[PDB]
Amino acid sequence: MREIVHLQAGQCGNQIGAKFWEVISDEHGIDPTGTYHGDSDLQLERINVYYNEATGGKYVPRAVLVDLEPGTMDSVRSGPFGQIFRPDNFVFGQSGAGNNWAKGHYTEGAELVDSVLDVVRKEAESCDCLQGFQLTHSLGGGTGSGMGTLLISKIREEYPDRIMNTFSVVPSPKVSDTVVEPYNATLSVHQLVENTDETYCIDNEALYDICFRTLKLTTPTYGDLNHLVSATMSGVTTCLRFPGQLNADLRKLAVNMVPFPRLHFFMPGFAPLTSRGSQQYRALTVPELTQQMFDAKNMMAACDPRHGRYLTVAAVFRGRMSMKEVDEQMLNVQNKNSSYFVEWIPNNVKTAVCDIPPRGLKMSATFIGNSTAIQELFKRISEQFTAMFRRKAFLHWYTGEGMDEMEFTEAESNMNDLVSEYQQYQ
């Protein structure tokens, strides 16, 4: 009836697409042989958004998982949850890009897109009324950062009305994984603004500054960090899959979060985060899911909006109460921190209510915040891309792959101005 056909890309894309499909599989009660051994029958109503159907009671996802070397899908085929994906749906190359945009944008990427563009038309066409797609990649690789931006630019041309979201991984600003990772990031962003409907922003020290300080952990794996960005990732498509008093979906949030199609840069969060030894010592009530969101610690971007303005602010609630006592906090927060919203909107906080809680939990909430706190995020790429390009550093990796220096020059002017477009509303 409505479906979501799912796109992944790389090592970021497969070590996140291995855990997102673990939380969804626990949500609808899916064991790693496919079948269903859940309790109720709210756990089988809207399962067709994510899972297909096959022989018997088998439910295999709508997943497109792509890389340019199969040393990443050798692991995800051989995890606990590796027999749940259909074997045709991995797409792998032979020689990857490896931290270069152009190699996986023209040379190796553009010869590999002609089989990924067959696995999506075989599978978007199976769906009855597809809502849209999701992507989750990183802007710091060469697999998802180059070719994943080339499937964004070449799936919006066949299906130009269906939805396009991105759980992107923008650079960590403080301690970084790769030297030349600015070049891969800043050329994707200009390729990202014209062909994406709405964009989240998922940083990795934005996850480190939670799990250090909020969950009190001293062994935080990525297998811990991928829960924190799949708790939200299924916390946006809740009301498609579960009923409520007031519903939403991926279409209705971007309606209230994209004032103009150059403006879809969010920063997400998540309410019920406490330690395991600080677990029983707090009552899980309504104001204690909204005292945490507006705080400057919960967000999944590494950017603080006290300098900026919350342009618009979303919310999606779970648990069998969001009706009157959420409406005296969303009325309270619009009045107390009165200088963090801009004047030219009536009111900013949007609301949905799903009534079914996450499993093992009583209540929750999830944030989608369109801000003028992303124009301080794209300036720390272009204060390090101009601390690199005046000395023409690493450039021989790019001009010999068929690019040219004006294409490097153009991604300066079309991201310096998008900060100068955001900068007025402060």
């Binding site: 409505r2 618009t312 409406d327 030219w344 909107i345």
Partner: protein
Amino acid sequence: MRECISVHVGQAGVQIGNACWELYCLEHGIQPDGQMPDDSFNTFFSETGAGKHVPRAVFVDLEPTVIDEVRTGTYRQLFHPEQLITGKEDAANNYARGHYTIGKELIDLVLDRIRKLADQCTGLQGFLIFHSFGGGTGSGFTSLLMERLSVDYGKKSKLEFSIYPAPQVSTAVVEPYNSILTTHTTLEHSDCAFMVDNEAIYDICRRNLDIERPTYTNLNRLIGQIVSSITASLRFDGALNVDLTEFQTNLVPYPRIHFPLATYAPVISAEKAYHEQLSVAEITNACFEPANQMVKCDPRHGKYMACCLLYRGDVVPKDVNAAIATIKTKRTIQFVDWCPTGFKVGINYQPPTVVPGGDLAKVQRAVCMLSNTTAIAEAWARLDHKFDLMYAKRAFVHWYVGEGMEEGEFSEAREDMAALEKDYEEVGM
């Protein structure tokens, strides 16, 4: 032969059409299977040669996960399979989605099913329409239904009972543009038009009843307690009767002014009403005090210019007329000069029916006043003030233009409101 075919549109349509059609199953003698375990059901239910009583209702939504639940749960075999209309995608807080593109393939299946019920009714009094300005189907498709309702039936009675947005809180952002541009269509295409605001039932349910922390269901029950008193005289006997034609006759002096209010008097809990006298004076005092209304705007700035009263149960015409003669005289309340008498009364024998799981007690008297006033000129003032605060930056308008729509509706729907904002003090003076 006294039929009242209901129209409910949306997620305010079906969460209200669940509560309204739950009261009538216990107001008359209806099992939730549809059977019975002395003919008042002929307004709402229809017969068969097996004793089954199928309602004369339509439930319209563009989202399947609101109406695929009513066909799943308890009141399942009561409703016909085809009386509940569902889309495949939702219009998603928009106008043109609801009005032009998506609303054009659900405008046709409904008008086959309105025509099938209306051919069954001989003496059909008129349609009732309940919807919400805050959504896509409730505000885009609903004004499209009434643009294609007037050609099929003309002067047939079509009443409005809309969920206007609240002046302090609201659930959304772009929701004024649906709320503004519905009124350009629902002025020529609405006979009478009630209003409610959910924050003005939030504070009532926690103050005037002890039940705090409600849901919309504890707000849906009081909305369904207005509608029983509207169709009160059509099914049960009365000392004086009202009818569907009577409300717009004595509350709509001018055809651009069809905006009453709604207020329900004895809102007191199952315990707090059990320990206090509730005379006819002591319920007509509640409907005039400005802390009991179903809107968040005080008529102390305004002038009452037509009225209507409904009564239930243990009422005597002497004590009705003893407390009317007080509230004429008090100067907390004033009228406009050009309405000389300013009332209409209607008395129904049958006392109202308690809902199991509700929050009201067994009572004997009740009042459903519908007093239109000049204090709705401070309602369109706030829905304008935040519309030209946000149309100055073109803040959302690109969602609407590329959806089978043109730009020029916005620059006339505000200039339509400017005339109707100037209408309400010429009549008000």
